[PDB]
Amino acid sequence: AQNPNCNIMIFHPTKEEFNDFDKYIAYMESQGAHRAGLAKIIPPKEWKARETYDNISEILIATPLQQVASGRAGVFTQYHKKKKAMTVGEYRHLANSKKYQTPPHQNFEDLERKYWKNRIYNSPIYGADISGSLFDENTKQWNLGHLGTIQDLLEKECGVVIEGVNTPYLYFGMWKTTFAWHTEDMDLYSINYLHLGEPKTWYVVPPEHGQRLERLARELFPGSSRGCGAFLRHKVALISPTVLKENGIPFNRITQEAGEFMVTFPYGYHAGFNHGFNCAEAINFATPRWIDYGKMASQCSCGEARVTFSMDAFVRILQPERYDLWKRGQD
Numbered sequence: 001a002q003n004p005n006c007n008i009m010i011f012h013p014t015k016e017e018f019n020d021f022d023k024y025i026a027y028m029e030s031q032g033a034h035r036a037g038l039a040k041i042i043p044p045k046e047w048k049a050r051e052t053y054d055n056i057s058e059i060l061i062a063t064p065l066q067q068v069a070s071g072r073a074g075v076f077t078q079y080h081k082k083k084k085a086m087t088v089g090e091y092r093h094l095a096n097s098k099k100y101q102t103p104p105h106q107n108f109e110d111l112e113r114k115y116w117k118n119r120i121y122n123s124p125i126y127g128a129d130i131s132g133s134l135f136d137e138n139t140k141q142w143n144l145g146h147l148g149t150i151q152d153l154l155e156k157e158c159g160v161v162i163e164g165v166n167t168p169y170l171y172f173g174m175w176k177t178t179f180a181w182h183t184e185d186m187d188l189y190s191i192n193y194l195h196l197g198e199p200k201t202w203y204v205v206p207p208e209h210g211q212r213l214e215r216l217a218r219e220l221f222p223g224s225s226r227g228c229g230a231f232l233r234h235k236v237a238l239i240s241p242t243v244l245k246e247n248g249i250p251f252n253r254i255t256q257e258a259g260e261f262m263v264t265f266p267y268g269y270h271a272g273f274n275h276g277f278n279c280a281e282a283i284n285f286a287t288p289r290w291i292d293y294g295k296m297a298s299q300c301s302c303g304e305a306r307v308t309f310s311m312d313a314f315v316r317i318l319q320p321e322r323y324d325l326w327k328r329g330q331d
């Protein structure tokens with residue numbers, strides 16, 4: 001069995017190996033990469049996402065979100081307070097202001113310590129889930145706006161044509177901006193490219209151990225758990241590495257830097273934080289191996305999680321018994 005300890009693997013494809021996305025995902029899996037829940041892919045040195053980042057300041061962040069925490073330093077929830085629109089140039093200036101800028105630190109480990117000690121005492125502002133892309137149209141390899149769609153994959157594997165589209169999203173971050181513990185919608189893969197700026201630290205639980213995380217989360221967030229059998233789908237709960245280690249939960253950590261891709265695998269719980277001003281692009285995708293995870297994915301039917309249009313068909317075809325309850329939650 002490849003990668004039995006479920007370590008995060010790092011890949012260095014050549015330019016030739018970078019030509020066929022599906023083939024390279026399947027290669028990484030043949031080496032056991034999925035067992036970690038997360039892999040890093042360093043593009044060949046011949047590759048670039050676009051020519052420069054000099055021309056992005058006029059992108060609008062229509063609904064910046066202030067991430068306000070409740071709880072204790074290692075076990076907290078965050079809610080997202082809506083703020084007034086601002087451009088990427090305005091947001092960058094904000095991120096670099098004295099109130100929000102990254103503190104002096106020694107190394108990634110010292111910054112991680114500072115994040116876990118101090119995150120709850122501040123409310124950083126995140127530009128999330130902005131539809132769009134920063135890949136140049138002439139980038140032909142690993143262009144996240146030109147991947148095969150999930151609707152086409154379901155059609156190829158199962159034979160049924162479905163409505164829906166699959167497009168990328170941009171994330172503009174600053175110090176302490178946080179992504180809570182979650183798997184992807186319908187336990188899909190994701191791919192995330194860090195276009196520019198400061199790093200992003202990730203935490204991940206192996207898919208084979210995902211239920212251990214869920215059980216701890218129900219214990220640590222007991223009112224949220226009563227509210228929703230799939231409350232991690234609300235994407236609000238944070239648990240520190242120290243708390244995970246105290247509770248014997250298997251996990252790994254890694255820091256992504258600008259110019260690097262991360263792939264999350266089906267049912268790989270993940271969480272993390274940004275080091276400073278940055279911009280990432282991410283999209284969900286599927287392979288033949290995903291279908292069995294999609295059929296078994298939990299769902300939030302309480303009203304909170306509220307998702308994309310395109311999830312309807314995935315529930316409807318893969319989970320017909322759950323569909324009527326899930327849809328009632330959407331309305």
Ligand SMILES: O=C(O)CNC(=O)C(=O)O
Nearest residue numbers: 171179190191192280282
């Ligand atoms: O960068 C982010 O805010 C969040 N990362 C992810 O959840 C991802 O690509 O799946």
Ligand SMILES: [Mg+2]
Nearest residue numbers: 056057058059
């Ligand atoms: Mg611009």
Ligand code: NI
Nearest residue numbers: 183184190270
């Ligand atoms: Ni994610």
Ligand SMILES: [Zn+2]
Nearest residue numbers: 228300302304
């Ligand atoms: Zn819910």
